[PDB]
Ligand binder design. Structure first.
Ligand SMILES: *CC(=O)N1CCN(Cc2cccs2)CC1
Ligand SMILES: *CC(=O)N1CCN(Cc2cccs2)CC1
Lengths: 304, 304
């Protein structure tokens, strides 16, 4: 029992982190097979970041300008290319610690673990979600760019995020490993505002199921609702509309607990309308939305 | 920017986890050098757990009864002994992935990362604190016992916790790596109630400093207080008394922010007396107490 914000074990990703330096800019890179992946803004000076022409800046760079260090060992760069907003540095040595991996582009509401790194050295691991506005709420200082986000299925790491940027509101923007930003963000030091940070309704419901499974039940009530009725409430409280697809995904948690999805929606509706009245759920005083239904089943079943 | 509940990267500990089976009981063990450490209740049947005599139960066990598997490879057990509530299984092979390590016994209010494991296989990593009542609030299913808690200083893992038990209230009890329980708990299926779960005041103050550093400032006020005045409030709200030692430890965060410790105590006093009025601090609707002052400095400075 107990339910915690839990990250994937990070060792498989730790084995892939390197330092990349171009001129006097240092950030992190991801070494899989004989390619190192890093944000293309490694080629920029702070001056360049105002309005960079990355194709033009990259012409002035050679293989020998990209200093790639894996712990204390230098890697030999034998090619480089730009793919969207990432550079791919071909090195002469396959990473011997390369795990089974995939590159995935995640949808808003999906969760992933971040291995925050500085100078190719892991500092910490925490759990994130791709927000509906395509930001993430991370913990990233200067030098953390190129840190990645991932999920693990048994022995296969699915990399879904590489860190590129901070918005003035303190939320985070990155790319997938094809270098395509999540959302409308660009790797330029310009006016970029996040849209509405809407709450991931299907995740809140999953977490309420987690709460019941782990003994927190005070918020269960005598009510039910409908998807359309619930969605009137979701709209008012800047929650994502609940769809039958979301109901279908919560089916296993419904089955395990014997609480119909729409009955849990009626509990959530009352929590939205009445607040928590100074009470807590799984140690939280607000409605937690960064556990997916898959996360809840995993943590409640002990998958490795 | 951003401030997240962050665990240590877990790879160094992942390399140490093994499965231990005695008869039909399977849990986790920690393989450092040529010793595997595990809870002594691995020798028990559920029957035995009511009132176990571990010295008497252990007489019926031989080296060959302890099945130790490191991934898919069996380890050869060449000795066993009991130290307090842990068994030490001597194996014929030093773990080649043994990190630099120490065994430390932590104090209440100290934080650590847990690598939750099942059948010697890591499932997840999360951050914990040793509570003032010597429980931890973890996420542990049957089979998770022997999962450990640790801190990392650069390249040295300090192991401070091994998981043994759940209290009926859903909080967790374990030992250090000498097998001595934190608090009054015993490895027996008996009436064990946790004492008051008091709030770790010095950690809340650290986290309020983290909040200011990361742009959350609404709770800063025009007031100051004294240690004795603040402590009258702490007593009323089941907070740990604040000492000059705690004030001294917050000195660096005081210095960095220019907010005197006793001024931050006056902010905390008003938050205790008035609540959050439906507002949040670093994404929390309650006062977070599982970041130490060292944690805040680390995450705010990007230590690896
Ligand atoms: C994440 C990180 O390390 N940094 C330092 C580099 N900096 C480059 C810029 C990208 C867009 C605006 S400036 C980003 C933050
Ligand atoms: C943590 C874990 O794996 N388990 C299974 C074994 N169980 C033994 C007991 C210890 C005291 C009471 S029963 C503990 C939970």
């Amino acid at each position: 029992s107990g339910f915690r914000k839990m990250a994937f074990p990070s060792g498989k990703v730790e084995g892939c982190m390197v330092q990349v330096t171009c001129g006097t800019t240092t950030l992190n890179g991801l070494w899989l097979d004989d390619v190192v992946y890093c944000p293309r803004h490694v080629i920029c000076t702070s001056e360049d970041m105002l309005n960079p022409n990355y194709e033009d800046l990259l012409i002035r760079k050679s293989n020998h300008n990209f200093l790639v260090q894996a712990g204390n060992v230098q890697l030999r760069v034998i090619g480089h290319s730009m793919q969207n907003c990432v550079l791919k540095l071909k090195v002469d040595t396959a990473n011997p610690k390369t795990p089974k991996y995939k590159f995935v582009r995640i949808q808003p509401g999906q969760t992933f673990s971040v291995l925050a790194c500085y100078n190719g050295s892991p500092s910490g691991v925490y759990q994130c979600a791709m927000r509906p506005n395509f930001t993430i709420k991370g913990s990233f200082l200067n030098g953390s760019c190129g840190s990645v986000g991932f999920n693990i299925d048994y022995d296969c790491v699915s990399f879904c995020y590489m860190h590129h940027m901070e918005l003035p509101t303190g939320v985070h923007a990155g790319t997938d490993l094809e270098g395509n930003f999540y959302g409308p963000f660009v790797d330029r030091q310009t006016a970029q505002a996040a849209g509405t940070d809407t709450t991931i309704t299907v995740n809140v419901l999953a977490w309420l199921y987690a709460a019941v499974i782990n003994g927190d039940r005070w918020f269960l009530n005598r009510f039910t609702t409908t998807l359309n009725d619930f969605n009137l409430v979701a709209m008012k409280y800047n929650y994502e509309p609940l769809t039958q697809d979301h109901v279908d995904i919560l089916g296993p948690l419904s089955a395990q607990t014997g609480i119909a999805v729409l009955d849990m929606c009626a509990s959530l509706k009352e929590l939205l309308q009445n607040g928590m009245n100074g009470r807590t759920i799984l140690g939280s005083a607000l409605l937690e939305d960064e556990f997916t239904p898959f996360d809840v089943v995993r943590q409640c079943s002990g998958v490795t």
